[PDB]
Symmetry: C3
Subunit: 449 residues, 3 copies
């Protein structure tokens, strides 16, 4: 049958000490709630009902493009009340899964298992086994079915030893949710309407509740503060790193690797310690990434080595290129095959043709550079004190001597040669040599201090 | 009643294989003994008696400003002998706490609990429970009181199973210390005067010894070598990081964060992996620190982003500034609000006014730069081959073209414009444009190799 | 008696998803098999028989200089078959130890113990105790001798609880190997000739099999994939770091330290977090290495501080030098005592004499620089558009003003002074001052946009 999701996301998250609401804090660069939305989508959810409240404005701005039903809860009166806000939108004959925006690690595979276990007109309850279950509601099984969730304060001595505990994550049909949510009271020490009470109500109705255990305890773990969030982060990164390792990526130390987005990789890729991969990154075969590198939204071709402490964003790098160490590629940097970019070099919104080298102490911006060019140490593209900054066009087989300024807009044609220390303002023709004529004063017998 | 401390700090620390004495090795940038002195002070210690010996010269030079009584022990004849060196200075009716300079993690809270437990004319003994207590003196409790510390070699089979062990940290009144220390012998396999023996002597005198357990085992842990020291370091950093996380600082990975000093922070601060914070650092609200940064003695205003691999020392940065990546701020760097400092830029002992940008491959030293200036790529402040280096003064709304040298002492007035590739030696007036007149040789039909 | 080794190295390593064969994947920069070869050599092995097969070409190119007997196995028919390939080369009266190229952490000390335990005409079997021994062959001891290795599928209930397990690593005499290997069959579910069967055959012959337990479980651990390899890496680095710590090297965090080669060190050396030491590195007394540094094949003298994010290769640095932060030393960089190299500086194949400073935004290549020189910010050595790049020779006590290009081949004699912004093409004489004569256009009342 069909499926829709409810995600509880209304919390203030006081103990985060933040201007953000609780579920917008990021794990691997992505709000916690976004992980849960994505998981709900990948399960095949037809609708995703997002129960929100605190930080409403920020929720709407941060998640504006999410395919969710925005259900604004004016007061937090308990989890059952929250789910009930979405209930008018439940189809009677679809399944509904209830998830929490502050528990981002829940997997599709566990949730498929949960949904699969749900008996007709009944409930599948996600449980977890804890070594110290103190404080949590104990699962009571009779004849394979959950007959009660006994809270800490009610449990007898033997019940307290039960390690299996309620997570609050559950699946039932829309009709059953509508029926049972209407029967939830708030007669308890907290005066709240608890979703937990559906298990009792199902049992009252001679409907079956089946427990499904989460394989990994961390999967169902939520974060109430940034210490807990950091723990989820570490768990998440280690899981990501382990997957890549088993796919054949050499990650020198998986404890010092961060992926904040998606990585596409070839074979024999090597990633040294303290690399951060952000956004959408694609690495070809035999790419080597040295220590300290940051790659954000880049495509790297086969056989590229990126040497240590290089930072790349919104860039493309052709096969057999060599980058770094201490290289900076800014958005729109496009390096062709067999190119060389060296230390203390910055390339912004420029194309660099096959075989060209830019190896030291250089800024190239808003430029086209052709094939087999030699861009000397200290070369700088610049503009007049004007408005909008213009383009520098360098053809093929050009030599630009060290510490030369190229003043845009300017064109240097194929095969041109430019002496060291030159200021280029006028276009340079094909096979034109331009050398600066210096005037020097020479003083003999100048004794230094 | 009053309190004073004795700190045992005389050890050579042979297994550190160092020219330093044992307690001067640092944890979080601070000698181990300094941690203990600070803790003693924060407890309200009136006097702190520092028992020192090996590396006496280095102790005195490294700890010259510490408010301690310098008690020079000419030979190490045991812990009781060490404490006895300070005993003539004990007030009869003050409490004395005995601490060890090679155990820096002991907390004020544990020591307050210890002092609180001390019975009149008796002793409060700090103990710890160990999973493998082999080798350590077993605590024997009879009717809530410590009646004996039974050493490994004396313990019977059931005593050996006791997990509670003596730490040597203890509190008693000054009169009692003076009395009992005089009765300590050295009739044992090591021929040493052990402070441990005070428990027996107290029990001989019908005085009460009460045990107080340390909550955290690591708290009472000492370091005899650099492997053990590294373990204390890691424990200490994790404790610091956890505190910051619970205060609402987002630390992406607390295992890759180091604080070596003090951090003051606002809300919504984010610190990426491999950041080191040294000395006194203050961060405002919504400061973001990218990977690899080092901040030593800096103040950073609200809404500043520091991008990766930036190194800052003895610097001030105004609100909404943007620094990095690959930026270097050296002592005396003062950046106003809304400033921009970019890659491969070094700023030393200079002020940079509101809105100004220094974005590439630049050295600014001993300079004043006003508001809304544009300092081009490759610009360098420099001096004559002289003595003492002089100041470069740049006014407001100045454009300095790329690869220009500013030769101090020189002044560039408001609104001036300087062309690329210029050498500025003479003062530039308000609204003065200075452009270098180049001479070039152009050779047509120059065929490159 | 004499000893030779057999190393099994023929595997494809399918689950590495690599073009390399299994044993060429590196641990600490060295192929797994190379670790094992070195260990075999350090044991005093007379011959080392390398059984290889998959990736034969790559084995031969990657290990071309190894002192091994190359034994090419045309098909993998089991471990006994592999060892039998080398058997014609066994001396009857030498010991043979069998090792696996995919288990690089095995120690000399464990293998000496194993060899020592071997009874005359018998076998010493290396075993390990596992907490979950499921799937592995259980060691059955009767009267101190191994009488059987019972596999998972054959073991009775009590045998399954045995934690001691077969590793496949074993020692016997050459004659005994030749005899028993000829009696190994392949009558089993896998149809393979298992070396394991020698234990049964020895027991058939009334020969003694003695078990020797590995002290460290990880020692005998192999890697079938890159996840397992990463675990071996971490274990290996932690062991290396711990050894250095106990020798008196201050490693701030041993979990963020990598050694890929050999380190020679003096006393009071301090290494901050995220340092990588590669090849052969020698550090003198009181060397301080800041965070993020990479040192490959370098010699560093006493009292040198290398500041953060410096990268050094094939370089020598004299005592009391100061390097970094953001410094790059490329092969052939030789810095004398008391030199200074600063941020965004690159030195390649150059010698720099005592007391000289190169502190900012500079490239020095193919150069000799004498003592007490001052190389200004922005200085660049360069060449003509020619063939082969030539040498720049700078004498003693030379001042080179900022943003000066030195165009090789050129010589600047002792005591010369060069103004800022100069292009040096002609040799500069002793005590010669060279200053560039600039032409400037000054335009008053130029109002900026
Ligand atoms: O009425 C509510 C209750 C709980 N919640 C959210 O559900 C999550 C779990 O609920 P409890 O902390 O009451 O067990 C939590 O993140 C909380 O903020 C709502 O969004 N609305
Ligand atoms: O006479 C002494 C004995 C011990 N000590 C110091 O006290 C600390 C603990 O003493 P023991 O290693 O004997 O248990 C240790 O750091 C040791 O160096 C002295 O300073 N003087
Ligand atoms: O015939 C063989 C069998 C095993 N081996 C190698 O020996 C190692 C251990 O053998 P098993 O995976 O069958 O237990 C493994 O690395 C495998 O590749 C050979 O080189 N040749
Ligand atoms: Mg210049
Ligand atoms: Mg320059």
């Amino acid at each position: 049958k069909a499926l829709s999701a409810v995600i509880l996301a209304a919390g203030k998250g006081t103990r985060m000490y933040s201007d953000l609401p609780k579920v917008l804090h990021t794990i691997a660069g992505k709000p916690m709630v976004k992980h849960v939305i994505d998981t709900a989508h990948q399960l095949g959810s037809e609708n995703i009902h997002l129960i929100y409240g605190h930080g409403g404005d920020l929720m709407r701005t941060h998640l504006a493009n999410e395919q969710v039903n925005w259900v604004l809860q004016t007061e937090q009166l308990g989890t059952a009340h929250a789910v009930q806000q979405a209930a008018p939108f439940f189809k009677d004959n679809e399944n509904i899964v209830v998830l929490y925006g502050d528990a981002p690690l829940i997997t599709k595979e566990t949730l498929e298992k949960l949904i699969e276990a749900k008996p007709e007109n009944g409930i599948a309850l996600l449980t977890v086994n804890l070594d110290n279950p103190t404080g949590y509601g104990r699962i009571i099984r009779e004849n394979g079915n959950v007959v009660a969730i006994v809270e800490q304060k009610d449990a007898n001595a033997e019940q307290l030893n039960i390690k299996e505990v309620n997570t609050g994550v559950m699946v039932s049909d829309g009709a059953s949710f509508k029926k049972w949510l209407a029967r939830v009271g708030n007669n308890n020490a907290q005066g709240e309407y608890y979703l937990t009470d559906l298990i009792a109500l199902a049992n009252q109705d001679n409907c079956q509740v089946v427990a499904v255990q989460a394989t990994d305890v961390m999967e169902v773990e939520g974060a109430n503060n940034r210490l807990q969030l950091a723990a989820l982060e570490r768990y998440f990164q280690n899981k990501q790193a382990s997957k890549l390792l088993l796919e054949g990526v050499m990650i020198y130390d998986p404890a010092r690797f961060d992926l904040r987005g998606t990585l596409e990789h070839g074979k024999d890729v090597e990633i040294d310690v303290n690399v951060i991969i952000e956004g959408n990154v694609k690495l070809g075969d035999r790419v080597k990434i040295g220590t300290g590198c940051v790659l954000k939204n880049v495509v790297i071709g086969n056989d590229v080595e990126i040497k240590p402490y290089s930072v790349l964003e919104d860039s493309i790098v052709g096969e057999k290129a060599a980058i770094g160490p201490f290289s900076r590629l800014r958005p729109g940097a496009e390096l062709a095959a067999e190119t060389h970019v060296g230390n203390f070099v910055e390339i912004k919104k420029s194309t660099v043709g096959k075989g060209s080298k830019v190896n030291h102490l250089t800024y190239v911006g808003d430029s086209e550079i052709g094939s087999n060019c030699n861009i000397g140490a200290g070369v700088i593209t610049c503009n007049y004190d004007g408005a909008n900054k213009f383009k520098t066009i360098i053809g093929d087989d050009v030599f630009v001597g060290s510490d030369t300024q190229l003043v845009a807009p300017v064109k240097v044609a194929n095969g041109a040669t430019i002496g060291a220390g030159t200021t280029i303002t006028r276009d340079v023709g094909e096979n034109e040599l331009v050398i600066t004529r210096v005037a020097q004063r020479h003083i003999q017998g100048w004794q230094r201090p």
